[PDB]
C-alpha cells in the first residue's frame, strides 16, 4: 500500500510529457519570436524531440 | 589504426604529444624572436599546463 505499479501507459505518458515540455519551450521561444502574422502551427513545433 | 571509413584512430596520447610539441616549438620560436616578456610568461604557463 506504499508501493504502486505504474504500467506501460503511465511511463509512456511520462516520456511523452517530457518531450512535450521540451517542445513547448521550443515553441514558446518561437512564439515569442515575432513575425507571427505569416506563421503556421507546423513550422513552430518540431517532431524531432517527441 | 584506420577506422575502415577513411580516417584514423583517436589515440589521445598522440593528441597530447602533438599539443605539447606545438606549445614547445611555438615557445622556442617565441624566445628566438626575443618577444617582450609578458607574452612568453603566459606561453610558459600554457606549456606547463600542457
Amino acid at each position: 500500500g506504499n508501493r504502486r505499479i505504474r504500467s506501460v501507459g503511465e511511463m509512456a505518458e511520462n516520456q511523452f510529457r517530457v518531450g512535450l515540455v521540451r517542445v513547448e519551450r521550443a515553441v514558446k521561444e518561437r512564439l515569442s519570436l515575432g513575425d507571427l502574422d505569416t506563421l503556421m502551427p507546423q513550422d513552430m513545433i518540431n517532431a524531432k524531440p517527441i | 589504426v584506420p577506422l575502415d571509413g577513411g580516417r584514423f584512430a583517436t589515440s589521445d596520447l598522440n593528441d597530447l604529444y602533438r599539443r605539447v610539441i606545438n606549445r614547445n616549438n611555438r615557445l622556442k620560436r617565441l624566445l628566438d624572436l626575443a618577444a617582450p616578456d609578458i607574452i612568453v610568461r603566459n606561453e610558459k604557463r600554457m606549456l606547463q599546463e600542457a
Binding site: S32, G34, D43 | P36
Partner: protein
C-alpha cells in the same frame, strides 16, 4: 545692462522660465560672468550633466568641472576606480575655497555624503605656487594635523619652520620639501634631501593625494572593527568583510561601508560649499530626488539580505529627501524651468522662443526653403553653431547655396543688429532671444525627421463592388478573398473559446484544409470573389513558409588554388627583394613630426621593420598586437623610408571607414614632405576613379589607400615597393596574394589585431617574421569581463549601472529579423532607457542618422548587429552586452571587447551565455579562453587560443582555419624549393603574366587539372606552363596525349581545359580579346583591329536580334540558353568557326 537680478539672500529662490533647449547653458554662462563667486549647477541626471559639461564651456571661458561621482550602483560590488577617487578628493580638496568657477554635480552625488574633512585637511596635501599663504598658518595647520617640529626633518610626521623657509616630511612620501614663504605667499617647492638638505626638484604644484578617500591604516582598522562589532555580527568566514579587512586587504564595494571608517557623522558636502555660492537648478529636483531615493531604498532591501556582505542603512550613506530640501533653504538658489511662470517677485520669464520649423529634405526641389525664407525676414543677427571644424565646411558650401556668409566669432555677445556668424561649440538646440532679436541655430536644427516609409495595403484601397458591402447573407462554399492571405472556401460560422472570451467566427478553408477563423466583428476584411470563376477559383496556402527551400547540393572546386599559390610563392622565393636605403637625419626629421615618444618595444619593432626593409631579402612581417597600442606610426615610419626611395606605397584595408580614418592619419602625418596621398573606395565617383587609377600608372600619387578596389585587375602600379595591409583576419588568401602576384619581390607588412590561425602558423613556422607589441603608452583599462547565463535582472542591472553612469550601451543581438521585437523586449525590461535600432540592412540613410544621433547622445541603448565591429569612435559607449555569445568568432570577440573602453572610465563587458550543457563544446572552449585572459597584451595569446582549437588551415590552399589533413610543412618546403630551382633552372616566365597575355575566356565552367590526375603540384604546375605557353594545336594535342600516356584516361576537367586552350588559340589568332560566357549567353569583345566580317556580323544581328546584339562597337551580347556546357563549348566553337570562315 543685464536682464534680471540675482538671489543674494540666505534661502531665497529665483524662478526663471520660458526656457527651451540649450538656452540654459548660455544663461548660466551669464550667471558666472556676472557673479563674483562660484556657480554650482545641480543636474537632474548624469547625461544632462555631461551634456551640459560641454555646453557651458561653449558659451563662456571660466574653468568648468564636474565632481567625479562614484561610477557604481548603490550598494554595488565594484570599486569606484581609485583614479576617479583621486580626481574626486582633489576637487574636494579645493572645494572649501574656490573663488570663481563652475561645478556641475548631479543629485546622485549631491544626495551622497562625503568624508568628514578631518582626514582630508590632515592626511593630504595639494599645494601650488600661486597660493598666497603665510608661515605660521601652515605651521599651525601641520600642528593641527599632528606633525612635529624637527628642524632637520627625516621622519613621517615632521616639519620644519625656520625664518622664512618651511620643510615638510609627510605620511605619504619619503621625502621632505622646502617651501620658502615670501610676502604671505608660497615661493618654492624644493624637493630636498632627508639629510643632505639640497633640492632634487623644483615643483610648482605638489600633489600628495591619499591612496583612498578613507583612512586605511591600523588605527582606522580597529576603529572599523569596533564599529562593525557594534553594528553587525561577525561570523567565522574567510570571505566575510570583517575578516577580509582584518587581513588588511580590501573587497570591491568596501567604500559603500563608508562611515565605519571614521566613527563620525558624515557631512552632506554642503560643508564643502564656499561662503556665498550660487546654486542653479535644471529641470527639477522635486521629481528626480524622489525616485532616486525610492530606487535607493528598493535596492537596499533588495540586498538587505545575505550575511555575506551586509549593508548599512541608507540614512548614513545619503541624505533623506527632506534633509536635502532643508539644506536647500541654506543657500540662495536659482530654479530654471521650461515654462512660463505668471508673475511675482524673485521671478522672471525671459524671451527664449523655440526656433521655427527649419528643416531640410531632398523631396523639395530647393532644399533650404525654410531657411531661405526665414533669414531675410529675421530682423536680428543669426548664429550657426557648428560643432566640428570640418563640419563647418559642411555648412560652408551649404549656405553658399543660399549665398549666406558665416563669420567665425568666439563670443555670443559679438552679435550685431543683423549679421550671419558661425560659432564653433557644443550646442544641440537653437532658440531666438527676442530681447535682442538674437538667433542661435544648431546643426541638429536642420534634420528633424528621422522617418521611415510605409508600404503594402493594396486591397484596402479596393473598396469596389467585390467587397460585397458586408452582406452577411453569403452562402457556404463561396470562394472568398481575404486580402492578407488570398482566396478560401467559406464553410460557415463557428463558435470558439479564446481564453475566457467565447466568440463567433467565420471558418474559411485555404489550401491543405487549414482553417482560418476571422471574427464576425472585423467582417470588412472579407470580400466576395471578383474573377467570376467561382467554380474555378484557386486556393492560397496559408503562411507562405517556404524555408524548406534550403536543402542541399551545391558543388565546388571550379578553380584550383594550390598550384597558383605554389607559383606565387616560388616566384617570391626565386627573385630577390629590394634593398632599401636609409637616411639618418632625413628619417630623424620625420621622427620629429611624431609629437610623441616611442615605447621601447614599439621602437625596436620599428627598428626591426627598417632593418629588414633595407635588405636584399623580401619583407614579410607580422606586426601583431592589441588594438590601440600604437600600430599605425610604425607603418608611418616604414612608409616614409619606403616613399623616399620612390617606391609607390600601397595601403589596403577591408572597409571604407578604416580607409577614411587612415586618409586623415596619413595626410596629417605627412604634412611637410613632397608626397601625394590619396584613397579609393566605392565612395569615390567613377570620374575620380578613372583619373586616380590612371595616374597610378603615371605615379605622382605615392601613397594610395583603399578597399578591395585595388585588387580589381586594372590597377597598375608603375613601381610597387611596399604593401601595407591592415586588420588582417579578412581577405581570404586570394585577395591577400593577388597583389603580390603583380610583383614577386614586393615587401609585405601585415598589421593585425589577432592574426588568423593560418598566418599565425605560417609566421611561427619560420616562413614569415613575427613582431609582437605590448605595453600601451596611456594606462588603459582591462575592462572587467564576465560570462554569465542569460538573466532578465542581470541585464537590467547592467543597463542601469551604465545609464546612471551617463554613457551609452552597445547591446548586440545579431539577427535582423527579430531585432525589432527584441527592442521592446529590452525596452519594457528597462523602461527608463532610450532605445533605437541600427543594423546594416537599412536604407543607408537612417543608419547614419542613428549613428550620428548616437554620437550626439540623443538615446542610450542601441540594439545592433555586428555593424559596430567596423570600429567607430564615441568612447562614451562603455558597456557591451552580447545577448547570445554562443555563435560568435573568438577573434571578433576580442575585437568587440576592444570597442568599449577608450577612456579613463572603467568600461564593462557582459557576455551572456546560454545554459552550459546546451552549447557546443567548442563554444565552451572559446568562452573559457575569453574568461581566462582579461589584460592588455593578451590579444596575441588569445589568437593562440583561436589556433589549436580549429586547426590552422592548409598551408597551400584557401580556408585559413581548419584541420583539413593538409600538406605537411616539411613536404611543403621541399615542394617549394623544387619549384624554386625548377623555376630559376632556365628563367621560366611567371605564370601570372601567362594569365595576363591570355585572352579572357571565362565561361563559368570548372576548368582545371584535378589532384587525383596529378598529385605532384610541380608537375601540374609545369603542365600549366606548357599548356598556356603552347602556341600550336599540334603542341596542345601532343601535351594531351602525353598526359594520357602518363596517367591513363583524360577526365572532363582536363578535356575542358584543353579545349578552352584551343579556343584561346583562335581567340588570339583573330583578335577576339574578351570572351565571357555563362548559362544565359555571354559577351564577345573583339579587338579594335578585329577579323570580324562587319556586313556578315550585321547579317547575324538582323537574322537573330534575340541572339546577337551589338551593345557597344565590338561588344556582342549573345543570348543563348546554354543549359549543357558541352553545347556551350560547341556553340562557341562553331561560332568562331563561322567567324574564321568570315575572317578578313
Amino acid at each position: 545692462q543685464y536682464r534680471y537680478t540675482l538671489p543674494v539672500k540666505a534661502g531665497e529662490q529665483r524662478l526663471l522660465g520660458e526656457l527651451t533647449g540649450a538656452a540654459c547653458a548660455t544663461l548660466v554662462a551669464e550667471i558666472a560672468e556676472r557673479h563674483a563667486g562660484p556657480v554650482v549647477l545641480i543636474a537632474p541626471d548624469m547625461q544632462n550633466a555631461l551634456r551640459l559639461h560641454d555646453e557651458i564651456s561653449q558659451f563662456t571661458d571660466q574653468m568648468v568641472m564636474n565632481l567625479a561621482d562614484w561610477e557604481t550602483l548603490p550598494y554595488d560590488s565594484f570599486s569606484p576606480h581609485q583614479d576617479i577617487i583621486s580626481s574626486r578628493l582633489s576637487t574636494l580638496y579645493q572645494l572649501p575655497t574656490m573663488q570663481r568657477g563652475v561645478l556641475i554635480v548631479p543629485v546622485n552625488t549631491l544626495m551622497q555624503r562625503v568624508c568628514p574633512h578631518s582626514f582630508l585637511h590632515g592626511h593630504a596635501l595639494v599645494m601650488k605656487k600661486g597660493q598666497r599663504l603665510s608661515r605660521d598658518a601652515l605651521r599651525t595647520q601641520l600642528d593641527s594635523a599632528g606633525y612635529r617640529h624637527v628642524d632637520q626633518v627625516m621622519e613621517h610626521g615632521e616639519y620644519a619652520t625656520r625664518g622664512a623657509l618651511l620643510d615638510l616630511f609627510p605620511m605619504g612620501s619619503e621625502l621632505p620639501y622646502r617651501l620658502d614663504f615670501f610676502d604671505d605667499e608660497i615661493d618654492s617647492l624644493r624637493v630636498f634631501d632627508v639629510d643632505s638638505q639640497r633640492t632634487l626638484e623644483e615643483v610648482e604644484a605638489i600633489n600628495l593625494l591619499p591612496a583612498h578617500e578613507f583612512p586605511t591604516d591600523k588605527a582606522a582598522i580597529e576603529l572599523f572593527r569596533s564599529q562593525w562589532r557594534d553594528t553587525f555580527e561577525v561570523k567565522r568566514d574567510p570571505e566575510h568583510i570583517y575578516q577580509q579587512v582584518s587581513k588588511g586587504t580590501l573587497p570591491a564595494g568596501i567604500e559603500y561601508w563608508q562611515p565605519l571608517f571614521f566613527s563620525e557623522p558624515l557631512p552632506p558636502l554642503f560643508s564643502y560649499f564656499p561662503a556665498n555660492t550660487l546654486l542653479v537648478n535644471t529641470g527639477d529636483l522635486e521629481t528626480s530626488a524622489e525616485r532616486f531615493q525610492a530606487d535607493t531604498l528598493a535596492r537596499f532591501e533588495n540586498r538587505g539580505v545575505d550575511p555575506m556582505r551586509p549593508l548599512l542603512p541608507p540614512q548614513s550613506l545619503w541624505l533623506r529627501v527632506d534633509e536635502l530640501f532643508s539644506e536647500l533653504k541654506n543657500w540662495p538658489r536659482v530654479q530654471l524651468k521650461t515654462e512660463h511662470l505668471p508673475t511675482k517677485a524673485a521671478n522672471a520669464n525671459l524671451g527664449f522662443q523655440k526656433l521655427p520649423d527649419l528643416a531640410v529634405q531632398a523631396q523639395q526641389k530647393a532644399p533650404l526653403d525654410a531657411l531661405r525664407k526665414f533669414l531675410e525676414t529675421f530682423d536680428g543677427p543669426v548664429v550657426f553653431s557648428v560643432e566640428s571644424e570640418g563640419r563647418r565646411e559642411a555648412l560652408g558650401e551649404l549656405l553658399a547655396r543660399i549665398k549666406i556668409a558665416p563669420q567665425r566669432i568666439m563670443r555670443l555677445d559679438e552679435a550685431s543688429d543683423r549679421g550671419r556668424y558661425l560659432m564653433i561649440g557644443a550646442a544641440e538646440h537653437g532658440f531666438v532671444d527676442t530681447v535682442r532679436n538674437l538667433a542661435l541655430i544648431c546643426e541638429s536644427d536642420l534634420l528633424g525627421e528621422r522617418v521611415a516609409r510605409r508600404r503594402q495595403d493594396s486591397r484596402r484601397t479596393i473598396n469596389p463592388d467585390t467587397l460585397i458591402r458586408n452582406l452577411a447573407e453569403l452562402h457556404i462554399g463561396q470562394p472568398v478573398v481575404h486580402l492578407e492571405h488570398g482566396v478560401g472556401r467559406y464553410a460557415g460560422m463557428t463558435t470558439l473559446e479564446a481564453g475566457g472570451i467565447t466568440g463567433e467566427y467565420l471558418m474559411l478553408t485555404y489550401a491543405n484544409d487549414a482553417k482560418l477563423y476571422v471574427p464576425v466583428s472585423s467582417l470588412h476584411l472579407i470580400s466576395r470573389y471578383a474573377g467570376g470563376a467561382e467554380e474555378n477559383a484557386p486556393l492560397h496556402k496559408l503562411g507562405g513558409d517556404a524555408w524548406s527551400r534550403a536543402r542541399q547540393k551545391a558543388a565546388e572546386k571550379v578553380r584550383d588554388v594550390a598550384a597558383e599559390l605554389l607559383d606565387i610563392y616560388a616566384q617570391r622565393a626565386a627573385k630577390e627583394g629590394f634593398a632599401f636605403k636609409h637616411d639618418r637625419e632625413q628619417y630623424q626629421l620625420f621622427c620629429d613630426s611624431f609629437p610623441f615618444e616611442t615605447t621601447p618595444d614599439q621602437a625596436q619593432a620599428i627598428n626591426a621593420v627598417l632593418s629588414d626593409m633595407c635588405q636584399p631579402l623580401a619583407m614579410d612581417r607580422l606586426v601583431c598586437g592589441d588594438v590601440g597600442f600604437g600600430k599605425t606610426e610604425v607603418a608611418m615610419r616604414a612608409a616614409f623610408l619606403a616613399v623616399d626611395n620612390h617606391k609607390q606605397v600601397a595601403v589596403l584595408v577591408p572597409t571604407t571607414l578604416l580607409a577614411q580614418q587612415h586618409y586623415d592619419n596619413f595626410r596629417d602625418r605627412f604634412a611637410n614632405w613632397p608626397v601625394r596621398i590619396e584613397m579609393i573606395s566605392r565612395f569615390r565617383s567613377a570620374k575620380e576613379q578613372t583619373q586616380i587609377l590612371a595616374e597610378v600608372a603615371e605615379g605622382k600619387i605615392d601613397i594610395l589607400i583603399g578597399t578591395h578596389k585595388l585588387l580589381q585587375s586594372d590597377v597598375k602600379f608603375k613601381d610597387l615597393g611596399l604593401l601595407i595591409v591592415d586588420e588582417e583576419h579578412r581577405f581570404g588568401v586570394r585577395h591577400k596574394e593577388r597583389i603580390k602576384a603583380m610583383r614577386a619581390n614586393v615587401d609585405i607588412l601585415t598589421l593585425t589585431a589577432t592574426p588568423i590561425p593560418r598566418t599565425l602558423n605560417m609566421a611561427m613556422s619560420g616562413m614569415r617574421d613575427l613582431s609582437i607589441i605590448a605595453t600601451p603608452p596611456a594606462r588603459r583599462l582591462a575592462v572587467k569581463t564576465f560570462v554569465r547565463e542569460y538573466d532578465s535582472m542581470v541585464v537590467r542591472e547592467a543597463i542601469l549601472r551604465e545609464i546612471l553612469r551617463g554613457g551609452q550601451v552597445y547591446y548586440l543581438y545579431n539577427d535582423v529579423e527579430n531585432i525589432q521585437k527584441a527592442a521592446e523586449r529590452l525596452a519594457e525590461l528597462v523602461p527608463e532607457a532610450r532605445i533605437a535600432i541600427g543594423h546594416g540592412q537599412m536604407r543607408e540613410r537612417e543608419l547614419e542618422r542613428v549613428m550620428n544621433d548616437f554620437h550626439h547622445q540623443r538615446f542610450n541603448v542601441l540594439v545592433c548587429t555586428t555593424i559596430i565591429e567596423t570600429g567607430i569612435d564615441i568612447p562614451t559607449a562603455n558597456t557591451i552586452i552580447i545577448e547570445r555569445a554562443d555563435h560568435f568568432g573568438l577573434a571578433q570577440l576580442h575585437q568587440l571587447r576592444g570597442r568599449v573602453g577608450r577612456s579613463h572610465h572603467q568600461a564593462y563587458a557582459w557576455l551572456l551565455t546560454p545554459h552550459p550543457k546546451a552549447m557546443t563544446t567548442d563554444a565552451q572552449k572559446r568562452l573559457e579562453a575569453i574568461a581566462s585572459l582579461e589584460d592588455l597584451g593578451a590579444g596575441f595569446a588569445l589568437a593562440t587560443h583561436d589556433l589549436e582549437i580549429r586547426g590552422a588551415g592548409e598551408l597551400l590552399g584557401e580556408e585559413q582555419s581548419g584541420s583539413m589533413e593538409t600538406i605537411g610543412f616539411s613536404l611543403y618546403m621541399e615542394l617549394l624549393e623544387n619549384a624554386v630551382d625548377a623555376l630559376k633552372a632556365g628563367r621560366e616566365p611567371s605564370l601570372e603574366d601567362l594569365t595576363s597575355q591570355q585572352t579572357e575566356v571565362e565561361l563559368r565552367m570548372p576548368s582545371l587539372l584535378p589532384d587525383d590526375f596529378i598529385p605532384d603540384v610541380n608537375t601540374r604546375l609545369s603542365f600549366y606552363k606548357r599548356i598556356a605557353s603552347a602556341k600550336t594545336e599540334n603542341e596542345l594535342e601532343e601535351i594531351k596525349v602525353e598526359l594520357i600516356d602518363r596517367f591513363g584516361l583524360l577526365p572532363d576537367p582536363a578535356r575542358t581545359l584543353l579545349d578552352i586552350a584551343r579556343l584561346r588559340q583562335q581567340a588570339q589568332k583573330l583578335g577576339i580579346r574578351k570572351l565571357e560566357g555563362n548559362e544565359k549567353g555571354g559577351v564577345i569583345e573583339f579587338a579594335e583591329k578585329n577579323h570580324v566580317n562587319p556586313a556578315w556580323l550585321i547579317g547575324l544581328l538582323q537574322k537573330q536580334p534575340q541572339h546577337y546584339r551589338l551593345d557597344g562597337p565590338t561588344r556582342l551580347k549573345f543570348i543563348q540558353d546554354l543549359s549543357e556546357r558541352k553545347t556551350r563549348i560547341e556553340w562557341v566553337r562553331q561560332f568562331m568557326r563561322e567567324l574564321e570562315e568570315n575572317a578578313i
